Amino acid sequence: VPLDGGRFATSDLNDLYRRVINRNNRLKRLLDLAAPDIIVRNEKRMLQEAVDALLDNGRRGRAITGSNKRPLKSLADMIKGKQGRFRQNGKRVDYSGRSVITVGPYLRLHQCGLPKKMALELFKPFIYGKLELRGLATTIKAAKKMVEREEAVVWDILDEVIREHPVLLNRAPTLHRLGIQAFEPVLIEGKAIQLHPLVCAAYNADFDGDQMAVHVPLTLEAQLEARALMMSTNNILSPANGEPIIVPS
């Protein structure tokens, strides 16, 4: 792919494929040219050293990259573990945010604050559905502007989209299953995700700079699960031992 500015940013599988095709194309010239056998033995053993640096690089002299000094990345190094598989054991994810948490002790046990600046960007495509069903905007491009100017009506439609829609708060080093719980949001103003006090002892969170990612369950079978299975009032006893986990801290 060409980087912006005139310079290209290739992979490093194009150096190991361009070296198998040279030493293999020269080995055809050397055989139709009838070279002495002392040379076409240095080409067979030199060809199959380039093919064995392609598949798994490192079980030999570790053919260092060109134009640099670090070893290239063979095919068996993309599959080979980074502590995780190439596929899903990692999945960065859409419809998400993150911000600082604060106290907000006025809440119930099943809700959480959520700024009006994240509720309007997490729930954007849900808003374009109301602004055309309710009949305010005409097309979906004309509605994309009303969510930019923040007219007085989009706050009326954003407050209605967030009616019974639970969101999944989750802290950074999720140790046990109580690191991901759901909460019914309530729009506050500011830029910090509030959080009930009884719940922070389960996340193991102090309020001195700790950030908390917030996801969004889209489908209809994924909101009846963030309400019956992963809600915050369904998790009052820890699963390690039956003793409670909502202890006033």
Partner: protein, 1339 residues
């Protein structure tokens, strides 16, 4: 008595008098680069000693040398600030003179031909600014020092895990500065073994390689036991002590006397029985020699065959053979089990080789396997490992540590090894095995030296100069030498390749952490242990992450990073200093017989092991006499008590143990060592607020950390202020400080609102007035986070400890709303947005002010040229720089074409790619830069900036004359009082008309002719300066290849405070603001004054930082004398009723060393001292010589406050009184720059990656969050299988299933059709691209 002292005197507690003043806080950097770039007329360290290390380059067997003459550093083209603008380094060309001489073919070796090539330019070397920070690409970088192992020998043990059966293996090692290592060792069989890290050899082969026969190898190590056969029984010699610790095995007899029997010990008087009785030649049996080993090799003088060679047994047959063979003087080796073990003789048994040539091949076929050896190829290899002056250099310091560890006489020597050095390391190793020696530790700070910038920048330079010497060695041998000067062979690209790639990319050449006058100062005193040639963040275990007993006064123990490399960063101490060689030293007071002197002796880390050092807090009765019989010292690493007539040294001050950043915490000895390690790292993060003031509770180490940095503009010569202004100061120096001929005045330019590295703003404000006399070392311009010279990092606000309705539940904080009205935590931030204009292949982009189909409201602030006005308030989404990129080949769908013909709209022939302000950031536009590649015509706007900035470079060049000639002519005209009566005729003529007249031939006209040279000199030089200054403005700029013109815009957004922000005091008490209460909810005492912040008290018992509870009482105390001078000075009572109170607030101690008041002016000083004190009398409390708790109570009775420290607050809303009184004080609160405006994020859909199609962010909508493999076991622990099937199929990866989920959501139908992700189909093509076949059985 400095004028910055008597404007606000800081009431100083502290009892121990100070004998040594704090040094210059940047001698680490500023000293070690003056050694690099400096003309040094000797072979000392420097750049000069990197030429002699290569030159002269004698030709390759052709006899034509290239010799080195001298070098020279030109002056840089661009200045510093002009280098931070054009975006290029600030360096100086390196001129070098070489003389190439041609020696004769076969005639006498004379100078047949020679040519001295004038200054072959061989690369530029960057220069250090006045503050120790380089300017590499317009961005100030810092080069932290290092802490690596010194070069020498370090005998080590490696006990415990050695073979899992005990029997430790004392291994030696040699480490040079540059070269191959060499590492002896023992093994579980007691057999020495040599080995850089290759396969190990039997150790005796490197002895044979040095041409030592097997005779001498038993000659050097072991002791002979002489043996003769005087016609009967083989009478054996004997030395008395050699019988030590042996099990007797016969009838010990001599002199007729049978001393002992067989099967017993040996006693002391048994050796005594031989000493006094002199038992020399004793007769013993011949069967006891049935296990000995011969010393030397015997042949038969009759036959001519060697019967016994070195390291051979002695049996009855050989006992039989050598008797009649004509031999009596037998020779054997004494080998004890404990004292003299047989460690070499065994290693001569597994020795496969036999001599030198048979030995060298054995190491060669280990060092280069596969290839066949040769006698000419094996010898040259081993001869170049440790014995070549150019492939092995121990050091100048290595040879010191080498000899110092073998107890050798001299200290200096050659750089390469020898035969005495490779052997003495083998004796000293085997002696450690027997028991008379001890191993070394590698964490000991006498084994680890510091490499500053001048010792890394040079080793990186000589590597760039050795790559050149290999090329000039070639060209001198190929061609003929009647034409090539010493300028066609020198290459500049290789030499400047190494010394530029180190300064611009490394583990050490890192950006300057610049958001304080304390984050800079403590980034140049950094002592890192990583980098090229050191540890690694992952391998390094807790052996070196610890705090030795040797760090006392050298390295701070309570200031390291807290992340994954704790104990590898080690901010250097306050008084510590580097040696000649590189080891850290500390200053101590020489203690004579009984009395403590004032002489200071900088002690190393191994000289400190012998002496007995006392403690800094030990009393002295005015004559250096310890007032105690015995004191508390430390001798070998442990403290204890010693007699008063035994100490040898005493420490300088109480704060010589702590860093420069941990010495600003007051009450440090009342905090946990954990909490004060987190409090020293949350103080170099604080942001310089809008108008910073001061700390009411300091440590007196603030005037040194704000002056010894670079932010303040300190006077350079005494004088009198003449013209203060917002952007300039003009000091008119005194006469005695002024130079004799044409000196004039000093003129300091300030640096108004500019940009730091973290995008904070950094500008200076003047703190002087007109007429105020400024003295040498004063302070004229405050910086960012400075005030009157001191270092203020934040504000100090009325804090009250109590739990308030759960808005400060956890560490969170609760801030009132009079702290947001007064606008005291508001900071300024200055970003830079750049709008480049590339040259595509469809045509060149343009900066048109007319953008295709954009509403007129968006084009309101753009002028006709396209670029925004300078002063406009922009917000999110606005256009700052209009730009259009060409685009043809429309090719629109069928419906889009029918939609055209119905409305006939013209096609768009250009795509709009303007620069737009980022989302949610809004503030004025305070500048604009416009660069233009040389060859394109400037637009109307870029040609206006080029004529508005040209008017200032000429105005500033003229105002340098007209205001300085205000001091030049006004001097000599005031000097022209003599030499002719010219007072009214002194101005009846024009002052310019003085080339005709003058003054008599004395000091009157001495300047009149001195100005005569300064007449034409300040005439054409200002003229010659102009025409070269108007070329750097009008000439083009060199942009990248492919760019046309660049436009940089600077927005200055002022970020206020809000919930989510992060605040923190000094003592490690972080927090996050959780609310901004109205003014009337906050608690109020009886007077009605609400508190300004409400902390939580449950953070003090658990984390033991009790500093913040005493700083809160000495806060309220210092502000009690605030509202006492603010009332007396408000009724304007009298300067006598005021002068006496202030004098009573300064003594106030228990044997304090204030030496203060009543020497002060009548009413000009006391009415200005009492005016700066009305906010509150600033206290100062040194680190460990604190203000005891009984002296804080003496202040609270001065301000008429409650001595206990606790007031009775009332509630804010209910109006009722809090039971059980509360604390209210004054905590100096910082404001960390973990602003919540940069943490918040949100994303619904954006830009997806390239190979795997998952989200990432470069288009103002960054990537989604990370759904790790830990957050997927939390969704399988539940039964959430429908949340997990979409969280990794439709929301992230599935290409044609995540667009259907976007039309089903706008269509009001929440349902998904998942499919299969793309991250898996990129795994079937990579497992297939091996031989492996893998598919999907469909059923």
């Amino acid at each position: 008595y400095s004028y910055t002292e008597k404007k606000r005197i800081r009431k100083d507690f502290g009892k121990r008098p100070q004998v040594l003043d704090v040094p210059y806080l940047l001698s680490i950097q500023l000293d070690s680069f003056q050694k690099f770039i400096e003309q040094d007329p000797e072979g000392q360290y420097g750049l000069e000693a990197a030429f002699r290390s290569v030159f002269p380059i004698q030709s390759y067997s052709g006899n034509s040398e290239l010799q080195y003459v001298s070098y020279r550093l030109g002056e840089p083209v661009f200045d510093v600030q002009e280098c931070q603008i054009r975006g290029v380094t600030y360096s100086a060309p390196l001129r070098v003179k070489l003389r190439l001489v041609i020696y004769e073919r076969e005639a006498p070796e004379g100078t047949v031909k020679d040519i001295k090539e004038q200054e072959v330019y061989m690369g530029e070397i960057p220069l250090m600014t006045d503050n120790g920070t380089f300017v590499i690409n317009g961005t100030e970088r810092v080069i932290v020092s290092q802490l690596h192992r010194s070069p020498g020998v370090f005998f080590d043990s490696d006990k415990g895990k050695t073979h899992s059966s005990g029997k430790v293996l004392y291994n030696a090692r040699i480490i040079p500065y540059r070269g191959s290592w060499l590492d002896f060792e023992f093994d579980p069989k007691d057999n020495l073994f040599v080995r850089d890290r290759r396969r190990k050899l039997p150790a005796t082969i490197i002895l044979r390689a040095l041409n030592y026969t097997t005779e001498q190898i038993l000659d050097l190590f072991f002791e002979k036991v002489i043996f003769e056969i005087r016609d009967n029984k083989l009478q054996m010699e004997l030395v008395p002590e050699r019988l030590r610790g042996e099990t007797a095995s016969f009838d010990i007899e001599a002199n007729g006397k049978v001393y002992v029997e067989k099967g017993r010990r040996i006693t002391a008087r048994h050796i005594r029985q031989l000493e006094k009785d002199d038992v020399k030649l004793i007769e013993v049996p011949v069967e006891y020699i049935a296990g000995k080993v011969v010393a030397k090799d015997y042949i038969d003088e009759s036959t001519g065959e060697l019967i016994c060679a070195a390291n051979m047994e002695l049996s009855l047959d050989l006992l039989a053979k050598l008797s009649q063979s004509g031999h009596k003087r037998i020779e054997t080796l004494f080998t004890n089990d404990l004292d003299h073990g047989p460690y070499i003789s065994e290693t001569l048994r597994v020795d496969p080789t036999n001599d030198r040539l048979s030995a060298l091949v054995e190491i060669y076929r280990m060092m280069r396997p596969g290839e066949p050896p040769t006698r000419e190829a094996a010898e040259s290899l081993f001869e170049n490992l440790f014995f070549s002056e150019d492939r092995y250099d121990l050091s100048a310091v290595g040879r010191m540590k080498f000899n110092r560890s073998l107890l050798r006489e001299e200290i200096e020597g050659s750089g390469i090894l020898s035969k005495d050095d490779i052997i003495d390391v083998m004796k000293k190793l085997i002696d450690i095995r027997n028991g008379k020696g001890e191993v070394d530790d590698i964490d000991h700070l006498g084994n680890r030296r510091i490499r500053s910038v001048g010792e890394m920048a040079e080793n990186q330079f000589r590597v760039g100069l050795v790559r050149v010497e290999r090329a000039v060695k070639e060209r001198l041998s190929l061609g003929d030498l009647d034409t090539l000067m010493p300028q066609d062979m020198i290459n500049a690209k290789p030499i400047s390749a190494a010394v530029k790639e180190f300064f611009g990319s490394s583990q050490l050449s890192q950006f300057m952490v610049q958001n304080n006058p304390l984050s800079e100062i403590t980034h140049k005193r950094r002592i890192s242990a990583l980098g090229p040639g050191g540890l690694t963040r992952e391998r390094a275990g807790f052996e070196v992450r610890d705090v030795h007993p040797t760090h006392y006064g050298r390295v701070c123990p309570i200031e390291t990073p807290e992340g994954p490399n704790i104990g590898l960063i080690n901010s250097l101490s306050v008084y510590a200093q580097t040696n000649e060689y590189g080891f850290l030293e500390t200053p101590y007071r020489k203690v004579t017989d009984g009395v403590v002197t004032d002489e200071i002796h900088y002690l190393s880390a191994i000289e400190e092991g012998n002496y007995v050092i006392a403690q800094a807090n030990s009393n002295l009765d005015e004559e250096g006499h310890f007032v105690e019989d015995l004191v508390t010292c430390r001798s070998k690493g442990e403290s204890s008590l010693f007699s008063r007539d035994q100490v040898d040294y005493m420490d300088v001050s109480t704060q010589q143990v702590v860093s420069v950043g941990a010495s600003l915490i007051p009450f440090l000895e009342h905090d946990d060592a954990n909490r004060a390690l987190m409090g020293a790292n949350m103080q170099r993060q604080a942001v310089p607020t809008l108008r910073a003031d001061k700390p009411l509770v300091g440590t007196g180490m603030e005037r040194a950390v704000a002056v010894d940095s670079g932010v303040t503009a300190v006077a350079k010569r005494g004088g009198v202020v003449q013209y203060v202004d917002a952007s300039r100061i003009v000091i008119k120096v005194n006469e005695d400080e002024m130079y004799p001929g044409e000196a004039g005045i000093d003129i300091y330019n300030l640096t108004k609102y500019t940009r730091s590295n973290q995008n904070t703003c950094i500008n200076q404000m003047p703190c002087v007035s007109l007429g105020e006399p400024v003295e040498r070392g004063d302070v004229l311009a405050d910086g960012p986070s400075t005030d009157l010279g001191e270092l203020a990092l934040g504000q100090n606000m009325r804090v009250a400890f109590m739990p308030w309705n759960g808005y400060n539940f956890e560490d969170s904080i609760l801030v009132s709303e009079r702290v947001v009205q007064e606008d005291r935590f508001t900071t300024i931030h200055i970003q830079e947005l750049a709008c480049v204009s590339r040259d595509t292949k469809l045509g060149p982009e343009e900066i048109t002010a007319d953008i295709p189909n954009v509403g007129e409201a968006a084009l309101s602030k753009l002028d006709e040229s396209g670029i925004v006005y300078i002063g406009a308030e922009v917000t999110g989404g606005d256009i700052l720089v209009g730009k259009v990129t060409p685009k043809g080949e429309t090719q629109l769908t069928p419906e889009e074409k029918l939609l055209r013909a119905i409305f006939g709209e013209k096609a768009s022939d250009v795509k709009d790619s303007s620069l737009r302000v980022p989302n949610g950031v809004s503030g004025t536009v305070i500048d604009v830069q416009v660069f233009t590649r040389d060859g394109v015509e400037k637009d109307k706007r870029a040609l206006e900036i080029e004529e508005m900035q040209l008017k200032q470079a000429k105005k500033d060049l003229s105002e340098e004359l007209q205001i300085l000639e205000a001091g030049l002519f006004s001097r000599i005209r005031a000097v022209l009082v003599a030499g002719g009566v010219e007072a009214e005729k002194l101005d009846k003529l024009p002052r310019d008309r003085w080339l005709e007249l003058g003054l008599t031939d004395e000091e009157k006209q001495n300047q009149l002719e001195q100005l005569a040279e300064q007449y034409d000199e300040l005439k054409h030089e200002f003229e010659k300066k102009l025409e070269a200054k108007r070329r750097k403005i009008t000439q083009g700029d060199d942009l990248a290849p492919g760019v046309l013109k660049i436009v940089k815009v600077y927005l200055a957004v002022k970020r206020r405070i809000q919930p989510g922000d992060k605040m923190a005091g000094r003592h490690g008490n972080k927090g996050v603001i959780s609310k901004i209460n109205p003014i009337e909810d906050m608690p109020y005492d009886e007077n009605g004054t609400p508190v300004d912040i409400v902390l939580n008290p449950l953070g003090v018992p658990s984390r033991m930082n009790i500093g913040q509870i005493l700083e809160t009482h000495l806060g309220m105390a210092a502000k009690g004398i605030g509202d006492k001078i603010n009332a007396m000075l408000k009724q304007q009572q009298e300067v006598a009723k005021l002068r006496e109170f202030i004098q009573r607030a300064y003594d106030l101690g228990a044997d304090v060393r204030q030496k203060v008041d009543l020497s002060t002016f009548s009413d000009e000083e006391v009415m200005r001292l009492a005016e700066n004190l009305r906010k509150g009398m600033p206290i100062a409390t040194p680190v460990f010589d604190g203000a005891k708790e009984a002296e804080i109570k003496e202040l609270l009775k001065l301000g008429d406050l409650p001595t206990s420290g606790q007031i009775r607050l009332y509630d804010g809303r209910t109006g009722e009184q809090f039971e059980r009184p509360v604390t209210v004080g004054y905590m100096y609160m910082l404001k960390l720059n973990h602003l919540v405006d940069d943490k918040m994020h949100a994303r619904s859909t954006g830009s997806y990656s390239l190979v795997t199609q998952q989200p990432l962010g470069g288009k103002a909508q960054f990537g989604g969050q990370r759904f790790g493999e830990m957050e997927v076991w939390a969704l399988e622990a539940y039964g959430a299988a429908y949340t997990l099937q979409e969280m990794l199929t439709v929301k992230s990866d599935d290409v044609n299933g995540r667009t259907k989920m976007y039309k089903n959501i706008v269509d009001g139908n929440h349902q998904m059709e998942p499919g299969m992700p793309e991250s898996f189909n990129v795994l079937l093509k990579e497992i297939r691209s091996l031989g492996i076949n893998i598919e999907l059985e469909d059923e």
